[PDB]
A = this chain, B = another copy of it.
Amino acid sequence: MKFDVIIIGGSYAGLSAALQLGRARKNILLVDAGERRNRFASHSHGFLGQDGKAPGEIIAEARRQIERYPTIHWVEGRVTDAKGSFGEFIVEIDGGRRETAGRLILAMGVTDELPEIAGLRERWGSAVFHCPYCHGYELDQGKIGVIAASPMAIHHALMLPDWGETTFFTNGIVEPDADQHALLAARGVRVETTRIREIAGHADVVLADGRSIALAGLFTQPKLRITVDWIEKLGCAVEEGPMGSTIVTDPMKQTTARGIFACGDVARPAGSVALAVGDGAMAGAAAHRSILFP
């Protein structure tokens, strides 16, 4: 039957949304495909109360708690289509199954598209990362590499000295100007301009000139993709730039489409678990308020 809210995506953001709506006893459906952005990492860091915990265990415990609310409904599955408008949205699940709802919350996360460097992808989440707060500390102030992939490369490079002795591999992507050259030096960054052939060993960068640089870990900047083809038909504006796509939201997490809210990495290009949880909580309350004061 017609749900009050369908939440598309059931990880940190979508669960945090569900929790608020279940405590308000609203009739909601969480639909989740179970492929979370941090599945590649062994331990989560930086989220208060859970620093060090396995990312899947944080989820498992959140779920045990959220399942105690009988108005929260759950389907494991993937939304293959969604359409309609305020008060009458229609969602298709696994190309079969169809459900309807008066409001939608989009909490799908993003997928990371990485530079095309042999060896890099296999190492994602174990020796190659994107977020220094997330995974820099445990490199124990060893040698750290930063691979340019994006316009922002130099900014990311200037951050990593606070975590170890940093080498910035421009990889033909970026050529710093005199002021950038001067700043990289003062901040103690080694700038390596030789192209990268592959990542080998734990996090050894093999350069095109034959040299190999042994590092404790590597960071680069992924391009973020939203992996559904139906956002346009719902009518939400999406911000599209060199580092990927983000659903536009206001400070209350409403998208440009009435009745549709978004939260988590799908709506924040530099997200974290702490922020997904915060933004999901806001999105659940805002959707509730849209039902109370329509």
Residue numbers of A with Cβ under 8 A of B are: 12, 15-16, 19-20, 23-26, 45-52, 58, 61-62, 65-66, 132-133, 136-137, 141, 158-159, 162-163, 251, 272, 274-275, 277-282, 285, 288, 292-293
Name the residue in A48, A50, A158 with the highest tally of chain B Cβ atoms < 10 Å from its Cβ: A48
Write out the residue numbers on chain B whose beta carbons fall within 8 Å of the beta carbon of A15: 48
Minimum CB–CB distance from A199 to chain B (whole Å) comes to: 24
Cα distance, A53 to B4, chains bound together (Å): 28
Write out the residue numbers on chain B whose beta carbons fall within 8 Å of the beta carbon of A136: 23-24
Closest to A137 in B: B23
Closest to A16 in B: B48
Cα distance, A133 to B285, chains bound together (Å): 9
Write out the residue numbers on chain B whose beta carbons fall within 8 Å of the beta carbon of A132: 24
Name the residue in A23, A251, A292 with the highest tally of chain B Cβ atoms < 10 Å from its Cβ: A23
Write out the residue numbers on chain B whose beta carbons fall within 8 Å of the beta carbon of A25: 137, 141, 162-163
Copies in the complex: 2
Cβ A16 vs Cβ B285 within 8 A? no
Cβ B272 vs Cβ A24 within 8 A? no
Minimum CB–CB distance from A175 to chain B (whole Å) comes to: 21
Closest 10 CB pairs of A and B: A278-B278, A274-B281, A51-B65, A23-B137, A16-B48, A48-B277, A48-B62, A24-B162, A275-B278, A49-B62
Cα distance, A277 to B280, chains bound together (Å): 13
Write out the residue numbers on chain B whose beta carbons fall within 8 Å of the beta carbon of A46: 19-20, 23, 281
Q: A61-B49, A281-B274 in contact; A292/B158 too (CB < 8 A)?
A: yes
Cβ A292 vs Cβ B12 within 8 A? no
Minimum CB–CB distance from A22 to chain B (whole Å) comes to: 8
Cα distance, A274 to B132, chains bound together (Å): 22
